[PDB]
Amino acid sequence: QTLFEQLNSKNVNDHTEQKNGLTYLAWSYAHQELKKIDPNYTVKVHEFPHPDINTENYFVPYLATPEGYFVQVSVTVKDSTETEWLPVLDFRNKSLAKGSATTFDINKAQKRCFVKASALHGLGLYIY
Amino acid sequence: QTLFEQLNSKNVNDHTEQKNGLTYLAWSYAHQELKKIDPNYTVKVHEFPHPDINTENYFVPYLATPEGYFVQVSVTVKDSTETEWLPVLDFRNKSLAKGSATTFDINKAQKRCFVKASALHGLGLYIYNGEELPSASDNDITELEERINQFVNLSQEKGRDATIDKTMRWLKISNINKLSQKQIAEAHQKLDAGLKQLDS
Amino acid sequence: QTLFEQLNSKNVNDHTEQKNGLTYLAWSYAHQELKKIDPNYTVKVHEFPHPDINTENYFVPYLATPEGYFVQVSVTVKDSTETEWLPVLDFRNKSLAKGSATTFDINKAQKRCFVKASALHGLGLYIYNGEELPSASDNDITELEERINQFVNLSQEKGRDATIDKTMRWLKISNINKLSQKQIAEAHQKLDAGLKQLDS
Amino acid sequence: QTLFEQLNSKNVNDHTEQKNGLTYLAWSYAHQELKKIDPNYTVKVHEFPHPDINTENYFVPYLATPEGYFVQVSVTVKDSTETEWLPVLDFRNKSLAKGSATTFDINKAQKRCFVKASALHGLGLYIYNGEELPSASDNDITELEERINQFVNLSQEKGRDATIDKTMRWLKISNINKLSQKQIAEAHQKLDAGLKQLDS
């Protein structure tokens, strides 16, 4: 068949967490499935020069803006490659203004953007 | 077979520590397993120019940001290579703001990020078991917000003025975000008491 | 066989020192073992410019940061090569802030990072069996905190409130973090004797 | 055989000095032994641009840092080459802060780093017994603290307790930290005759 149909036709419902009334598939499960489909795949978290610091050769792993914070993840499964944008949010799914975020908030956002990037490929698209 | 399936099918449960209710596999065990699978493998801790110092040729081993602190570890097992990001956290798994971290906090985070890189490999894939996705019961702290808003609304529904900040003043909570779990239960007790009588 | 298995299967228990309840093997022993395995092996201590000095061609042998201090050691045994980061720490295994470290603290950390780098190869990986992860006496401190907070909770539960500072005050401990183990035991008995009877 | 085993199997015990309770082999003996093993061998003391001065082409022979002072010595015996770092220390084995060191302190540290670099070779590698790790081997002096506290501990155990400063007054020691090793033995004699007999 094809990668999207094969990946799309799977049940990731069992490995999900209901937080805030939303459904999330754990990254651990996503990492394994893709690894099975493709032994050698790549996950890259983009790094962007942080604004306020403005130090030469200083690249933080997330966007920092007065409006808020952005993360980017690029998942290359087999030949196919793709990228996802996730906005950093509170544990209540609310926005975080410049200077109110914690490194923990960024890593959680980064992990969530990964599964969403995986969701672009057939796996668990129905959830996202 | 293949590296991920072989590595994935192992029990690292015996070599784990239960701290804060989370499960962690010790780095020593990870270093030996990979070493057995591949005699020559590389672990690299990325170094990034520290912002405040801004000295030429000055590269600290961790990110320093006003928002907080980040670490990166790249594990190359056999041909396969991969990288992981871990935030620096307190011994209570809380974030550390710029200027509140200690070198010891960074080294612990560096070691943790290493086993997470091993976790990306088949070894210790399920040890985390998506324990990072749950809100660690602060959603119950969010429940407090739903119950104070229910009080505010049902009070307004009676036609009586009510404000979240004054409802918060009932609980006398300085920061609804940081409140001890016993205090959340104590606050819930206050709200239900007010809320139940309107129902009667 | 292979270098990791040969090196891993050794007993370095006899040459160890129990300080602070942790176990370490002397660099002397590590230097000889590797020298036997490989007559010509290299140990390199990385040098990075001190941030405050910022003098051209000035390279100190350790990282200096507002957050703290870091050291790096790269051990090349035979063809295999590897590196270890470590935080410079006090004699009580506590972090040292920028401007509180002494050259002696750095050299001790450099020697310790060497044996840890050797531990990456099979020799001494078990002696340092993820010894960083365990409490290493942090519980000796958390336990006292759990028992004082437990009393505060039971007293407040008796309907009479008590404060953590007052519980710290009767033990007359200036810093709950620094207290001799005999003093923790001396502090623990009154609290744990009282808690069971108070809860009745 | 090989250089490390030949050099390792020697007795340098006769040419040693017991100062502060640590064992040191004199450089003169090290210079001759290596000279015999290899007629042409090189000793190089690294030079690093001094920070405060910051004069072009100005290279002092030692590191100068706000944290303290570091020296480096590279000994090339035969083909083999190697290097050792060390902290400059007082006559009491205590650290020297920036601006408190004297050129004599640096030369003594340079000579000591030489023998330690030679110790990297087989000769006397384990004879040092890693004196650097245990608070510069002041544990023998720290034992005095355990034995004076034991003398105080019997007092607390029995009807009347005695303050440590007065126990120190028995030894009449102005600074328990700086005391000659013969005086530590003499002090032990005082304490053991009181403390040991009671225990026995």
XYZ file of all heavy atoms in Angstrom, chain D residues 91-173:
661
model
N 51.265 26.187 53.714
C 52.094 25.165 54.410
C 51.179 24.271 55.257
O 51.645 23.214 55.724
C 53.220 25.844 55.196
C 52.788 26.893 56.192
C 51.955 26.578 57.254
C 53.209 28.206 56.055
C 51.564 27.552 58.161
C 52.813 29.177 56.961
C 51.992 28.849 58.012
N 49.914 24.678 55.420
C 48.925 23.875 56.187
C 48.028 23.125 55.204
O 46.977 22.618 55.641
C 48.027 24.793 57.016
C 48.765 25.676 58.010
C 47.796 26.588 58.734
N 47.070 27.449 57.813
C 46.159 28.342 58.182
N 45.865 28.497 59.461
N 45.546 29.077 57.269
N 48.417 23.076 53.927
C 47.560 22.444 52.888
C 46.178 23.109 52.857
O 45.173 22.381 52.903
C 47.512 20.921 53.026
C 48.864 20.283 52.781
O 49.835 20.975 52.482
N 48.932 18.964 52.881
N 46.139 24.442 52.810
C 44.856 25.177 52.661
C 44.957 25.984 51.363
O 46.089 26.196 50.912
C 44.632 26.085 53.866
C 44.568 25.373 55.211
C 43.446 24.362 55.290
C 42.081 24.983 55.088
N 41.001 23.974 55.170
N 43.830 26.390 50.783
C 43.865 27.085 49.471
C 44.357 28.528 49.627
O 44.193 29.092 50.726
C 42.508 27.050 48.848
O 41.566 27.661 49.716
N 44.929 29.098 48.561
C 45.374 30.519 48.592
C 44.517 31.336 47.624
O 44.503 30.988 46.435
C 46.854 30.567 48.201
C 47.836 29.997 49.222
C 49.264 30.234 48.760
C 47.630 30.697 50.552
N 43.856 32.386 48.112
C 42.936 33.180 47.271
C 43.728 34.147 46.399
O 44.913 34.346 46.680
C 41.970 33.925 48.149
N 43.091 34.729 45.382
C 43.824 35.611 44.434
C 44.436 36.787 45.205
O 43.681 37.481 45.914
C 42.883 36.047 43.307
C 43.512 36.881 42.201
C 42.536 37.213 41.096
C 43.157 38.020 39.976
N 42.178 38.318 38.904
N 45.751 36.997 45.075
C 46.447 38.082 45.790
C 46.976 37.675 47.152
O 47.459 38.563 47.865
N 46.893 36.401 47.524
C 47.488 35.981 48.820
C 48.660 35.009 48.641
O 49.093 34.455 49.662
C 46.442 35.390 49.710
O 45.417 36.336 49.975
N 49.089 34.760 47.402
C 50.155 33.757 47.170
C 51.515 34.453 47.097
O 51.548 35.661 46.791
C 49.879 32.976 45.910
N 52.588 33.708 47.371
C 53.955 34.279 47.271
C 54.748 33.416 46.292
O 54.482 32.206 46.229
C 54.636 34.361 48.643
O 54.888 33.039 49.120
C 53.826 35.146 49.653
N 55.664 34.030 45.541
C 56.428 33.291 44.499
C 56.999 31.987 45.076
O 57.126 31.016 44.302
C 57.469 34.223 43.860
O 58.175 33.488 42.859
C 58.439 34.807 44.866
N 57.315 31.958 46.375
C 57.843 30.725 47.009
C 56.760 29.645 46.974
O 57.075 28.478 46.666
C 58.296 31.003 48.442
C 58.846 29.796 49.157
C 59.954 29.126 48.664
C 58.251 29.321 50.315
C 60.459 28.014 49.317
C 58.756 28.207 50.966
C 59.858 27.556 50.466
N 55.515 30.037 47.259
C 54.391 29.069 47.220
C 54.309 28.467 45.817
O 54.050 27.252 45.711
C 53.064 29.725 47.608
C 53.067 30.320 49.003
O 53.284 29.557 49.964
O 52.831 31.538 49.120
N 54.532 29.282 44.781
C 54.352 28.761 43.396
C 55.483 27.767 43.107
O 55.189 26.690 42.556
C 54.318 29.913 42.371
C 53.322 31.003 42.770
C 54.047 29.376 40.973
C 51.894 30.527 42.884
N 56.716 28.095 43.493
C 57.830 27.183 43.127
C 57.646 25.849 43.858
O 57.867 24.803 43.223
C 59.208 27.792 43.392
C 60.323 26.910 42.873
O 61.160 26.434 43.634
N 60.326 26.661 41.572
N 57.239 25.878 45.134
C 57.009 24.616 45.832
C 55.937 23.792 45.124
O 56.086 22.571 44.965
C 56.612 24.880 47.281
C 56.420 23.622 48.111
C 56.072 23.928 49.567
C 55.855 22.668 50.393
N 55.518 22.980 51.808
N 54.860 24.444 44.687
C 53.809 23.740 43.961
C 54.326 23.197 42.637
O 53.933 22.105 42.215
C 52.615 24.664 43.733
N 55.195 23.948 41.960
C 55.768 23.465 40.707
C 56.601 22.212 40.926
O 56.483 21.235 40.175
C 56.607 24.565 40.057
C 55.788 25.610 39.318
C 56.634 26.732 38.761
O 57.838 26.796 39.002
N 56.008 27.623 38.003
N 57.446 22.213 41.964
C 58.241 21.023 42.256
C 57.350 19.836 42.614
O 57.574 18.711 42.141
C 59.234 21.306 43.383
C 60.129 22.515 43.150
C 60.792 22.474 41.780
C 61.889 21.423 41.716
N 62.471 21.319 40.349
N 56.324 20.068 43.436
C 55.429 18.978 43.814
C 54.686 18.424 42.606
O 54.553 17.201 42.462
C 54.445 19.451 44.885
C 55.000 19.371 46.293
C 53.916 19.534 47.341
N 53.446 20.913 47.437
C 52.632 21.364 48.378
N 52.178 20.571 49.335
N 52.264 22.640 48.363
N 54.247 19.289 41.696
C 53.537 18.813 40.476
C 54.464 17.943 39.618
O 53.953 17.047 38.940
C 53.003 19.969 39.646
S 52.133 19.428 38.160
N 55.770 18.230 39.659
C 56.766 17.421 38.910
C 56.734 15.973 39.396
O 56.595 15.062 38.559
C 58.172 17.998 39.091
C 59.273 17.120 38.555
C 59.315 16.761 37.218
C 60.266 16.639 39.395
C 60.328 15.945 36.734
C 61.279 15.826 38.911
C 61.306 15.480 37.579
N 56.875 15.770 40.706
C 56.926 14.381 41.250
C 55.583 13.702 40.956
O 55.594 12.498 40.657
C 57.295 14.356 42.748
C 58.698 14.891 42.980
C 56.296 15.102 43.613
N 54.478 14.445 41.057
C 53.141 13.878 40.738
C 53.099 13.487 39.258
O 52.528 12.425 38.945
C 52.057 14.898 41.108
C 52.054 15.285 42.579
C 51.012 16.313 42.944
C 51.057 16.682 44.411
N 50.819 15.504 45.279
N 53.677 14.314 38.385
C 53.748 13.959 36.948
C 54.600 12.698 36.794
O 54.233 11.830 35.984
C 54.310 15.113 36.156
N 55.700 12.611 37.544
C 56.545 11.388 37.521
C 55.711 10.218 38.049
O 55.862 9.099 37.520
C 57.796 11.583 38.329
O 58.557 12.673 37.827
N 54.861 10.491 39.045
C 54.000 9.446 39.643
C 53.036 8.912 38.586
O 52.567 7.777 38.746
C 53.238 10.022 40.805
N 52.748 9.705 37.553
C 51.896 9.195 36.449
C 52.655 8.018 35.836
O 52.017 7.001 35.517
C 51.637 10.337 35.462
C 50.960 11.553 36.095
C 50.438 12.517 35.045
C 49.836 11.126 37.025
N 53.978 8.131 35.728
C 54.781 6.976 35.245
C 54.687 5.883 36.314
O 54.082 6.111 37.377
C 56.201 7.446 34.909
C 56.192 8.539 33.895
N 56.641 9.814 34.164
C 55.738 8.564 32.636
C 56.478 10.570 33.087
N 55.937 9.829 32.145
N 55.218 4.697 36.030
C 55.045 3.593 36.993
C 55.577 3.925 38.375
O 54.954 3.477 39.356
N 56.611 4.764 38.474
C 57.268 4.970 39.794
C 56.317 5.558 40.839
O 55.771 6.651 40.590
C 58.465 5.902 39.582
C 59.246 6.263 40.843
C 60.093 5.088 41.303
C 60.117 7.488 40.611
N 56.128 4.854 41.962
C 55.344 5.385 43.096
C 53.956 5.878 42.728
O 53.504 6.837 43.375
N 53.283 5.259 41.758
C 51.975 5.835 41.349
C 51.004 5.697 42.528
O 50.371 6.708 42.893
C 51.469 5.071 40.121
C 50.382 5.741 39.277
C 49.628 4.727 38.446
C 49.429 6.617 40.071
N 50.955 4.517 43.151
C 49.970 4.272 44.241
C 50.559 4.652 45.602
O 49.801 4.683 46.588
C 49.503 2.813 44.204
C 50.602 1.785 44.308
C 51.431 1.720 45.416
C 50.820 0.876 43.287
C 52.443 0.781 45.511
C 51.826 -0.072 43.366
C 52.642 -0.120 44.481
O 53.643 -1.057 44.565
N 51.866 4.913 45.655
C 52.529 5.230 46.955
C 51.931 6.534 47.497
O 51.748 6.630 48.724
C 54.062 5.249 46.800
C 54.551 3.894 46.281
C 54.744 5.630 48.102
C 56.045 3.770 46.147
N 51.646 7.497 46.618
C 50.963 8.741 47.062
C 49.656 8.377 47.777
O 49.205 9.162 48.634
C 50.711 9.663 45.866
C 51.950 10.239 45.229
C 52.931 9.423 44.693
C 52.141 11.609 45.156
C 54.071 9.947 44.111
C 53.274 12.152 44.571
C 54.243 11.316 44.047
O 55.372 11.836 43.465
N 49.076 7.220 47.447
C 47.782 6.788 48.049
C 46.713 7.878 47.909
O 45.880 7.993 48.829
C 47.938 6.380 49.518
C 48.876 5.208 49.714
O 49.886 5.324 50.403
N 48.549 4.075 49.113
N 46.730 8.647 46.815
C 45.656 9.633 46.583
C 45.444 10.564 47.765
O 44.279 10.733 48.169
N 46.519 11.148 48.303
C 46.418 12.037 49.494
C 45.581 13.275 49.149
O 45.057 13.905 50.086
C 47.798 12.466 50.003
C 48.585 13.334 49.034
C 48.976 12.687 47.718
O 49.707 11.685 47.759
O 48.563 13.196 46.659
N 45.514 13.645 47.867
C 44.780 14.867 47.444
C 43.288 14.759 47.776
O 42.723 15.768 48.241
C 44.903 15.037 45.930
C 46.333 15.139 45.436
C 46.462 15.239 43.926
O 46.010 14.305 43.234
O 47.013 16.247 43.445
N 42.673 13.594 47.551
C 41.196 13.459 47.726
C 40.724 13.687 49.172
O 39.716 14.402 49.331
C 40.750 12.081 47.218
C 40.957 11.814 45.726
C 40.561 13.021 44.889
C 42.383 11.380 45.419
N 41.363 13.144 50.237
C 40.824 13.292 51.601
C 41.163 14.598 52.337
O 41.915 14.532 53.292
C 41.474 12.115 52.348
C 42.805 11.936 51.658
C 42.532 12.264 50.206
N 40.610 15.725 51.873
C 40.930 17.050 52.467
C 42.451 17.190 52.599
O 42.920 17.521 53.699
C 40.219 17.262 53.786
O 40.596 16.284 54.744
N 43.186 16.902 51.521
C 44.665 17.003 51.548
C 45.198 16.129 52.688
O 46.159 16.558 53.355
C 45.092 18.443 51.695
N 44.568 14.974 52.923
C 45.032 14.023 53.969
C 45.181 14.722 55.328
O 46.193 14.468 56.009
C 46.295 13.311 53.547
O 46.711 12.379 54.535
N 44.219 15.570 55.713
C 44.263 16.162 57.081
C 43.410 15.256 57.972
O 43.113 15.658 59.108
C 43.843 17.636 57.152
C 42.404 17.938 56.768
O 41.491 17.384 57.410
O 42.206 18.795 55.887
N 43.036 14.081 57.458
C 42.181 13.127 58.214
C 42.890 12.737 59.515
O 42.188 12.519 60.513
C 41.833 11.898 57.371
C 43.056 11.134 56.910
O 43.906 11.676 56.209
N 43.154 9.873 57.302
N 44.221 12.625 59.493
C 44.972 12.327 60.742
C 44.712 13.461 61.740
O 44.508 13.159 62.932
C 46.460 12.122 60.445
C 47.306 11.786 61.662
O 47.354 12.610 62.596
O 47.906 10.694 61.669
N 44.701 14.711 61.269
C 44.386 15.868 62.160
C 42.889 15.828 62.486
O 42.528 16.118 63.639
C 44.798 17.194 61.490
C 46.264 17.172 61.051
C 44.497 18.377 62.397
C 46.724 18.448 60.387
N 42.053 15.487 61.501
C 40.592 15.357 61.740
C 40.348 14.241 62.762
O 39.380 14.360 63.537
C 39.850 15.100 60.423
O 40.171 16.160 59.522
C 38.349 15.001 60.595
N 41.191 13.201 62.771
C 41.030 12.145 63.805
C 41.141 12.790 65.191
O 40.347 12.421 66.075
C 42.086 11.056 63.611
C 42.019 9.944 64.640
C 43.079 8.873 64.447
O 43.877 9.002 63.498
O 43.104 7.917 65.244
N 42.090 13.713 65.368
C 42.213 14.434 66.661
C 40.842 15.005 67.040
O 40.472 14.909 68.223
C 43.268 15.538 66.527
C 43.489 16.392 67.774
C 44.244 15.613 68.839
C 44.238 17.668 67.425
N 40.114 15.556 66.061
C 38.780 16.144 66.339
C 37.834 15.034 66.812
O 37.122 15.246 67.801
C 38.237 16.845 65.094
C 36.873 17.473 65.306
C 36.312 18.181 64.084
O 36.997 18.189 63.042
O 35.191 18.718 64.178
N 37.874 13.876 66.156
C 37.014 12.738 66.569
C 37.411 12.323 67.985
O 36.511 12.013 68.786
C 37.191 11.565 65.604
C 36.358 10.352 65.969
C 36.539 9.168 65.039
O 37.679 8.675 64.929
O 35.542 8.739 64.426
N 38.704 12.340 68.309
C 39.119 11.823 69.643
C 38.822 12.858 70.741
O 38.482 12.429 71.860
C 40.576 11.353 69.588
C 41.117 10.820 70.908
C 42.473 10.182 70.696
N 42.323 9.006 69.849
C 42.901 8.841 68.665
N 43.629 9.813 68.145
N 42.750 7.706 68.005
N 38.912 14.158 70.440
C 38.542 15.184 71.460
C 37.022 15.153 71.652
O 36.578 15.246 72.807
C 39.066 16.587 71.086
C 38.404 17.138 69.821
C 40.581 16.585 70.975
C 38.890 18.506 69.417
N 36.260 15.003 70.565
C 34.782 14.883 70.699
C 34.436 13.606 71.475
O 33.515 13.666 72.304
C 34.062 14.991 69.351
C 34.141 16.380 68.753
O 35.223 16.913 68.530
N 32.990 16.992 68.525
N 35.149 12.505 71.213
C 34.923 11.265 72.005
C 35.186 11.568 73.483
O 34.368 11.144 74.321
C 35.813 10.116 71.526
C 35.491 9.628 70.122
C 36.424 8.528 69.679
O 37.327 8.124 70.408
N 36.216 8.039 68.468
N 36.275 12.284 73.789
C 36.510 12.659 75.204
C 35.337 13.517 75.688
O 34.735 13.171 76.721
C 37.850 13.370 75.403
C 38.310 13.287 76.833
C 38.624 12.062 77.398
C 38.358 14.415 77.635
C 39.021 11.971 78.721
C 38.751 14.321 78.958
C 39.086 13.101 79.499
N 34.886 14.477 74.878
C 33.674 15.275 75.243
C 32.438 14.360 75.283
O 31.578 14.582 76.155
C 33.473 16.445 74.260
C 32.156 17.170 74.484
C 34.643 17.416 74.297
N 32.341 13.386 74.373
C 31.161 12.476 74.294
C 31.040 11.629 75.565
O 29.899 11.393 75.992
C 31.172 11.598 73.038
C 30.981 12.386 71.760
O 30.793 13.600 71.794
N 30.992 11.699 70.629
N 32.161 11.176 76.131
C 32.074 10.429 77.415
C 31.455 11.357 78.460
O 30.640 10.877 79.264
C 33.462 9.961 77.861
C 34.148 8.948 76.949
C 35.299 8.283 77.686
C 33.156 7.895 76.478
N 31.865 12.628 78.453
C 31.359 13.611 79.446
C 29.844 13.755 79.292
O 29.137 13.690 80.314
C 32.055 14.930 79.268
O 33.459 14.771 79.394
N 29.373 13.933 78.055
C 27.914 14.055 77.801
C 27.240 12.748 78.227
O 26.155 12.815 78.838
C 27.663 14.349 76.322
C 26.191 14.494 75.967
C 25.991 14.782 74.500
O 26.945 14.875 73.730
N 24.738 14.924 74.099
N 27.872 11.610 77.929
C 27.314 10.288 78.316
C 27.239 10.199 79.843
O 26.223 9.687 80.354
C 28.196 9.173 77.753
C 27.719 7.777 78.106
C 28.596 6.664 77.560
O 29.600 6.979 76.891
O 28.273 5.485 77.807
N 28.268 10.689 80.541
C 28.312 10.592 82.027
C 27.606 11.808 82.641
O 26.981 12.569 81.877
C 29.753 10.393 82.509
C 30.455 9.189 81.893
C 31.843 8.876 82.421
C 31.891 8.316 83.830
N 31.331 9.224 84.856
N 27.688 11.981 83.964
C 26.928 13.057 84.633
C 27.280 14.464 84.175
O 26.339 15.261 84.003
N 28.565 14.780 83.986
C 28.933 16.183 83.646
C 29.601 16.245 82.269
O 30.577 15.507 82.056
C 29.854 16.783 84.714
C 29.233 16.859 86.101
C 27.976 17.706 86.135
N 27.402 17.756 87.470
C 27.227 18.868 88.172
N 27.591 20.033 87.665
N 26.692 18.814 89.379
N 29.111 17.126 81.391
C 29.711 17.286 80.039
C 30.737 18.425 80.072
O 30.567 19.345 80.894
C 28.637 17.519 78.973
C 29.209 17.706 77.578
O 29.884 16.777 77.096
O 28.983 18.782 76.992
N 31.757 18.357 79.211
C 32.791 19.420 79.147
C 32.861 20.013 77.735
O 32.790 19.237 76.766
C 34.128 18.862 79.565
N 32.995 21.339 77.631
C 33.044 22.025 76.309
C 34.320 21.642 75.549
O 35.359 21.437 76.210
C 32.933 23.545 76.475
O 34.057 23.987 77.237
C 31.651 23.969 77.157
N 34.241 21.557 74.217
C 35.411 21.143 73.381
C 36.552 22.160 73.507
O 37.713 21.724 73.576
C 34.976 20.955 71.913
C 33.784 20.001 71.795
C 36.147 20.507 71.052
C 33.313 19.785 70.378
N 36.243 23.460 73.511
C 37.316 24.493 73.553
C 38.217 24.214 74.760
O 39.444 24.374 74.629
C 36.739 25.910 73.580
C 35.844 26.177 74.775
O 34.828 25.472 74.910
O 36.175 27.081 75.566
N 37.624 23.829 75.892
C 38.407 23.467 77.109
C 39.150 22.147 76.881
O 40.266 22.006 77.415
C 37.525 23.384 78.357
C 36.880 24.692 78.796
C 36.017 24.531 80.030
C 35.353 25.818 80.468
N 34.515 25.617 81.673
N 38.552 21.204 76.149
C 39.287 19.953 75.819
C 40.495 20.357 74.972
O 41.592 19.829 75.223
C 38.372 18.941 75.119
O 37.278 18.668 75.995
C 39.081 17.652 74.767
N 40.299 21.299 74.050
C 41.415 21.820 73.217
C 42.438 22.463 74.154
O 43.646 22.316 73.898
C 40.881 22.860 72.228
C 41.855 23.974 71.916
S 41.161 25.186 70.763
C 40.420 26.342 71.914
N 41.959 23.125 75.210
C 42.865 23.799 76.177
C 43.754 22.751 76.857
O 44.892 23.100 77.226
C 42.047 24.591 77.200
C 42.881 25.315 78.246
C 42.015 26.065 79.240
N 42.811 26.754 80.245
C 42.797 28.068 80.444
N 42.023 28.841 79.701
N 43.555 28.604 81.384
N 43.247 21.526 77.025
C 44.101 20.440 77.569
C 45.314 20.335 76.646
O 46.453 20.389 77.149
C 43.329 19.117 77.597
C 44.069 17.973 78.220
C 45.305 18.003 78.797
C 43.652 16.598 78.247
N 45.662 16.753 79.225
C 44.671 15.868 78.892
C 42.514 15.916 77.802
C 44.582 14.495 79.108
C 42.427 14.560 78.016
C 43.445 13.861 78.663
N 45.065 20.212 75.339
C 46.163 20.107 74.340
C 46.873 21.460 74.260
O 48.023 21.492 73.781
C 45.601 19.684 72.979
C 44.899 18.326 72.937
C 45.604 17.309 73.818
C 43.425 18.433 73.288
N 46.197 22.531 74.689
C 46.778 23.899 74.618
C 47.128 24.189 73.153
O 48.215 24.737 72.887
C 47.968 24.014 75.578
C 48.596 25.394 75.709
C 49.764 25.431 76.671
C 50.382 26.807 76.794
N 49.402 27.806 77.281
N 46.234 23.808 72.234
C 46.489 24.030 70.779
C 45.739 25.291 70.331
O 44.504 25.336 70.472
C 46.102 22.773 69.974
C 44.619 22.422 70.120
C 46.977 21.600 70.378
C 44.207 21.178 69.372
